[PDB]
Design an enzyme around this catalytic site. Structure first.
Site, PDB file in Angstrom:
ATOM      1  N   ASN A   1       0.863  -1.180   0.000  1.00  0.00           N
ATOM      2  CA  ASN A   1       0.000   0.000   0.000  1.00  0.00           C
ATOM      3  C   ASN A   1       0.900   1.230   0.000  1.00  0.00           C
ATOM      4  O   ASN A   1       1.537   1.543   1.007  1.00  0.00           O
ATOM      5  CB  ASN A   1      -0.892  -0.018   1.246  1.00  0.00           C
ATOM      6  CG  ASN A   1      -1.795   1.203   1.348  1.00  0.00           C
ATOM      7  OD1 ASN A   1      -1.880   2.017   0.430  1.00  0.00           O
ATOM      8  ND2 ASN A   1      -2.478   1.327   2.475  1.00  0.00           N
TER       9      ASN A   1
ATOM     10  N   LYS B   1      -0.017   4.260  -0.127  1.00  0.00           N
ATOM     11  CA  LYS B   1      -0.675   5.363   0.567  1.00  0.00           C
ATOM     12  C   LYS B   1      -0.531   6.649  -0.248  1.00  0.00           C
ATOM     13  O   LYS B   1      -0.536   6.599  -1.476  1.00  0.00           O
ATOM     14  CB  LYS B   1      -0.093   5.520   1.974  1.00  0.00           C
ATOM     15  CG  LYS B   1      -0.288   4.248   2.792  1.00  0.00           C
ATOM     16  CD  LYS B   1       0.057   4.402   4.267  1.00  0.00           C
ATOM     17  CE  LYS B   1      -0.185   3.081   4.986  1.00  0.00           C
ATOM     18  NZ  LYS B   1       0.045   3.156   6.448  1.00  0.00           N
TER      19      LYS B   1
ATOM     20  N   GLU C   1      -6.533   4.081   8.200  1.00  0.00           N
ATOM     21  CA  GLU C   1      -6.554   5.510   7.945  1.00  0.00           C
ATOM     22  C   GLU C   1      -7.945   5.988   7.509  1.00  0.00           C
ATOM     23  O   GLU C   1      -8.359   7.094   7.864  1.00  0.00           O
ATOM     24  CB  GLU C   1      -5.472   5.871   6.917  1.00  0.00           C
ATOM     25  CG  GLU C   1      -4.076   5.977   7.543  1.00  0.00           C
ATOM     26  CD  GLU C   1      -2.998   5.263   6.746  1.00  0.00           C
ATOM     27  OE1 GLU C   1      -3.039   5.320   5.503  1.00  0.00           O
ATOM     28  OE2 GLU C   1      -2.099   4.653   7.368  1.00  0.00           O
TER      29      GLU C   1
ATOM     30  N   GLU D   1      -4.530  -5.561  10.804  1.00  0.00           N
ATOM     31  CA  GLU D   1      -3.511  -4.551  11.015  1.00  0.00           C
ATOM     32  C   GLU D   1      -3.783  -3.750  12.278  1.00  0.00           C
ATOM     33  O   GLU D   1      -4.567  -2.807  12.257  1.00  0.00           O
ATOM     34  CB  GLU D   1      -3.453  -3.605   9.818  1.00  0.00           C
ATOM     35  CG  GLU D   1      -2.993  -4.268   8.544  1.00  0.00           C
ATOM     36  CD  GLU D   1      -2.604  -3.264   7.485  1.00  0.00           C
ATOM     37  OE1 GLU D   1      -1.669  -3.558   6.715  1.00  0.00           O
ATOM     38  OE2 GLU D   1      -3.233  -2.186   7.420  1.00  0.00           O
TER      39      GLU D   1
ATOM     40  N   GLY E   1       2.985   2.119  10.859  1.00  0.00           N
ATOM     41  CA  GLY E   1       3.975   3.178  10.730  1.00  0.00           C
ATOM     42  C   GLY E   1       4.738   3.579  11.977  1.00  0.00           C
ATOM     43  O   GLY E   1       5.438   4.596  11.976  1.00  0.00           O
TER      44      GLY E   1
ATOM     45  N   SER F   1       3.981  -2.362  10.265  1.00  0.00           N
ATOM     46  CA  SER F   1       5.426  -2.348  10.423  1.00  0.00           C
ATOM     47  C   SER F   1       6.117  -3.648  10.033  1.00  0.00           C
ATOM     48  O   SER F   1       6.996  -4.144  10.744  1.00  0.00           O
ATOM     49  CB  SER F   1       5.794  -1.956  11.855  1.00  0.00           C
ATOM     50  OG  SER F   1       5.376  -0.626  12.112  1.00  0.00           O
TER      51      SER F   1
END
Lengths: 257, 245
Positions: A18, A20, A104, A172, A178, A218
């Site tokens: 991804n 992003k 997100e 996730e 992140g 991560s």
């Protein structure tokens, strides 16, 4: 409740990248270059998700072995929804994948379980495959509600009566996204076993053993092999590392030795 | 103030339908007195840019507030520029009311977009209930005050007044209603910013603008153009572009 039995290795591995909100022609060119040069680990479904404006570009340059996915989409094919894209457009571009329910989208842009379930139902009806994301926040896990969060997010689409052949579940943990705070192999394996237990009871044993469940949060070139040791972890959803050559090392770590 | 006509395709389009729109737009001759901008869905921005005549500029339908980062599903001004574009629509009614974007978020997006060097079609508008309650002025001023509070400059901002009740309903504002609001908007700008900005800032009207009413709406002096949704998907969009011709 959290099952205990480990699944067998009967599902095709899956590794998604991804990107992003990252990418411009030059940097996308760079990524496509190392992706194309990479070995065709046929033992792994490899999917990458560029920002919407670069979807067609990426597809035109990528080798057949790397599939392109949209990062999100809406719940109808056409209409007055400025800023949105639909599965119809995804299909028009020649794509067959979309990521839905990403952390997100749920926590930064407030997408509800109901909305995400509607999007999923519609995407599936359209013939596109879905990487369905679920995950709990740090405070929720500490309150002992990891199962409660994942259950609710998954139950949202069970209630819509979706089929599961074209769904890849991505667990996730929000706290691992992140932050470098990767879930341990043990923590991931236990959640994935629980997810399969959920599928076995809510759907069927067949679906439980056929549905790919990938871990995200991560994942790096250094921990991929270690996480891949767990039979219930069928691959990964990679964020930051998908923008670098290390993404290939992650794919290699997952592929058949 | 030079006439400005924008076509927001919203969530409409595939290569075939986009080709059809590009065709009638390219067939038309450029109008020196009118700036034309169209906003394709994100996946078709580059395609539209490569196919459209230079006279029609392409704009993104939305964007975020940083150049790059972990914001799945978002695009940034940096990407818009990389695509060779210089326009973006922000604060559109659908973003504010369907997807809940706050006045503050929209203002932050606007500040960032302007800092990046791209132009912004800043959308504002009151709902039917707000107009009936006598808050047309209050609502539109509040949405504008949000960017005034951020201290934005206005040379690259086109204000789009689009009452929510007029979007896709056919319930177009009358010329008098629109003219009234645009005058209020300029008064707001003259006071909060400056007379120069009040006179230079283009304020366009949006909300069920069609080839049937564009010519009449275009006669109102404080309306500097239109933001067109549904009608931008058909050939008569050209008649709207030439509303003052």
């Amino acid at each position: 409740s959290t099952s205990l039995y480990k699944a067998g290795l009967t599902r095709k591995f899956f590794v998604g990248g991804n990107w992003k909100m990252n990418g411009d022609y030059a940097s996308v060119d760079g990524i496509v270059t190392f992706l194309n040069a990479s070995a065709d680990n046929s033992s792994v479904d490899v999917v990458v998700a560029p920002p919407a404006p670069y979807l067609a570009y990426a597809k035109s340059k990528l080798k057949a072995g790397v599939l392109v996915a949209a990062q999100n989409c809406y719940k109808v094919p056409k209409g007055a929804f400025t800023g949105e894209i639909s599965p119809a457009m995804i299909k028009d571009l020649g794509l067959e994948w979309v990521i839905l329910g990403h952390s997100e989208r749920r926590h930064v842009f407030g997408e509800s379980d109901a909305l995400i379930a509607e999007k999923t139902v519609h995407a599936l009806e359209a013939g596109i495959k879905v990487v369905f994301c679920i995950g709990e926040k740090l405070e929720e896990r500490e309150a002992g509600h990891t199962k409660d969060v994942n259950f609710r997010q998954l139950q949202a689409i069970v209630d819509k009566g979706v089929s599961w052949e074209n769904i890849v579940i991505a667990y996730e943990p929000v706290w691992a996204i992140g932050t470098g705070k990767t879930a341990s192999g043990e923590q991931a394996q236990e959640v994935h076993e629980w997810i399969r237990a959920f599928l076995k009871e809510k759907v069927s044993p067949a679906v439980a053993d056929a549905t790919r469940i990938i871990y995200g949060g991560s994942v790096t070139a250094d921990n991929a092999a270690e996480l891949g040791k767990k039979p219930d972890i069928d691959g990964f959803l990679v964020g930051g590392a998908s923008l670098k050559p290390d993404f290939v090392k992650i794919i290699n770590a997952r592929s058949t030795a």
